[PDB]
Design an enzyme around this catalytic site. Structure first.
Site, mmCIF file in Angstrom:
data_model
loop_
_atom_site.group_PDB
_atom_site.id
_atom_site.type_symbol
_atom_site.label_atom_id
_atom_site.label_comp_id
_atom_site.label_asym_id
_atom_site.label_seq_id
_atom_site.Cartn_x
_atom_site.Cartn_y
_atom_site.Cartn_z
ATOM 1 N N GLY A 82 2.844 6.271 9.548
ATOM 2 C CA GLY A 82 4.232 6.166 9.143
ATOM 3 C C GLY A 82 4.967 4.941 9.658
ATOM 4 N N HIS A 90 0.830 -1.230 0.000
ATOM 5 C CA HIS A 90 0.000 0.000 0.000
ATOM 6 C C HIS A 90 0.835 1.237 0.000
ATOM 7 C CE1 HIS A 90 0.332 0.987 4.334
ATOM 8 N NE2 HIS A 90 -0.025 -0.248 4.649
ATOM 9 N N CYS A 96 4.049 1.854 9.190
ATOM 10 C CA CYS A 96 3.845 0.705 8.326
ATOM 11 C C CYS A 96 5.159 0.259 7.700
ATOM 12 C CB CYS A 96 2.827 1.024 7.233
ATOM 13 S SG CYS A 96 1.218 1.441 7.884
#
EC number: 3.4.19.12
Lengths: 302, 302
Positions: free
Chosen positions: B143, B41, B145
């Site tokens: 942030g 993503h 991820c």
């Protein structure tokens, strides 16, 4: 979101850990520039620890009696010195992995990360508080002495703790990196009283703020209190007295949440007097005092 | 002695963390050999996350749309590929800091360390469990991820988790390093049910053993139980059923302590039915299930 007891990344400290051997005893040391720091009781037998005369015991040692090993590398010891309760072994090589660092003497109630090590090899990292009575509730086995506590501020590692001893009570004591014990303890195997501990009130308040930020709001009440009224309850429950300095430190968290410090004190009062009715706050059934206001802000703003 | 929730030293993983940017989105990636792994993503706008067609979205990207930065170093991307929900960016340089590593898919109830990172820079490390329902209760902000979970076995880093999403419920979900979600989750911003969680019984038993080892024995009782009788209580209290495999795993801790597994189950039963009467065990007012039997043995034998 979420709130975890979070240690600092340990890599910078991992590169400074070495094994120090002197006669039979082995423990950990901290290799920074061309100096190795370790607890001076590395020079003691188990019999010596009942009542050591460190000056006499060290006079019987020479540079070559100190065996310092970084991984498989052997360091050559070219000077030795005792500062308070640390030994400083001058070695012929500067650690290529020396981070930017400072030595600091932290204040009771502040927090730091501990890299627990055995034989100069890192085992684990965890976050802990210096208790008001200058002990710490750690995880330290035989061989963990010389393991260090630290904080990181951008690029700079501030070393604040070296582990020296487990008291019979099972709590842990140690020094700053200049070798001065935190608290009234000495590096001798005798009964030593730590004296009464108390809960770090400003940290409990910081963690209640952390809880509000994360959705746990059930403990917010309709009351407020005064500093002096709240402190009468703190004393009854063996909480550190709250001062205006503490109020000031909580300011940013008060601002983020729109909850006045004295209103949060009133929530805390009710929890002290009534317990938690079997409820939890951020997954704890007790009031947590191992986060400082700075710990909470760091964790909430990444 | 003492018992702490202890993470693994993070240095080996710190050296593999990088920032990955694609259009406006920035997150963390894991640089091992000449491949960077990150959540797919990273290619999504915030609008795309409501219902992304990752195949179509990736077809609009070329190697040069992926901006990979290790500290201040820029890596050159020479290949890109989507495996399940991870992107694999082939870069022209092998990470000089690649540790020995494996990719593993852990089992629910196992534990691992998380290095939480932002913009490719490490912020903190903490220990956590994969819940029976395959979520984790982490600390992850915008942030984070691409931050990864791992265990260390001597020299070898076993990567088991990559963070992908926060559910509306505030719990965290992610993949193994081949990009397969743990649990029924997808990388889409929709309501997703995690389904009922349960307490990891074998871990609670391991922690009671840890407590006995450390002097907390108040919960040891004069009763015993059967596996099937204990499991009738486990079900009532939403504890995972205990099997003989679990009994076998607790064997070494039973041996060290001289406490039969089924006797410890009887203590646990009494705690489930009676609570803790305001008492604590290893400083917790709740039953802790985030230590595995291996976690306890590691911590008790250094």
């Amino acid at each position: 979101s979420g709130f975890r007891k979070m240690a600092f990344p340990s890599g910078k400290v991992e590169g400074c850990m070495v094994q120090v051997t002197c006669g039979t005893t082995t423990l950990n040391g901290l290799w920074l520039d061309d100096v190795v720091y370790c607890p001076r009781h590395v020079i003691c037998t188990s019999e010596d620890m009942l009542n050591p005369n460190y000056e006499d015991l060290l006079i019987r040692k020479s540079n070559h009696n100190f065996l310092v090993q970084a991984g498989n590398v052997q360091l050559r010891v070219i000077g030795h010195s005792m500062q308070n309760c640390v030994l400083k072994l001058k070695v012929d090589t500067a650690n290529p992995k020396t981070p930017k660092y400072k030595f600091v003497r932290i204040q009771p109630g502040q927090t730091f990360s501990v890299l627990a090590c055995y034989n100069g090899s890192p085992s684990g990292v965890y976050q802990c508080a210096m208790r008001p009575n200058f002990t710490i509730k750690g995880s330290f086995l035989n061989g963990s002495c010389g393991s260090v506590g630290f904080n990181i501020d951008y690029d700079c590692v501030s070393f604040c703790y070296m582990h020296h001893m487990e008291l019979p009570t099972g709590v842990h004591v140690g020094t700053d990196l200049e070798g001065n014990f935190y608290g009234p303890f000495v590096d001798r195997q005798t009964a030593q009283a730590a004296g009464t501990d108390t809960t770090i009130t400003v940290n409990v308040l910081a963690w209640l703020y952390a809880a509000v930020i994360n959705g746990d709001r059930w403990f917010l009440n309709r009351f407020t209190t005064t500093l002096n009224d709240f402190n009468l309850v703190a004393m009854k429950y063996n909480y550190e007295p709250l001062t205006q300095d503490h109020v000031d430190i909580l300011g940013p968290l008060s601002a983020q949440t729109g909850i006045a410090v004295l209103d949060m004190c009133a929530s805390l009062k009710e929890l002290l007097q009534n317990g938690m009715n079997g409820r939890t706050i951020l997954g704890s059934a007790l009031l947590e005092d191992e986060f400082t206001p700075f710990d909470v802000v760091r964790q909430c703003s990444g």
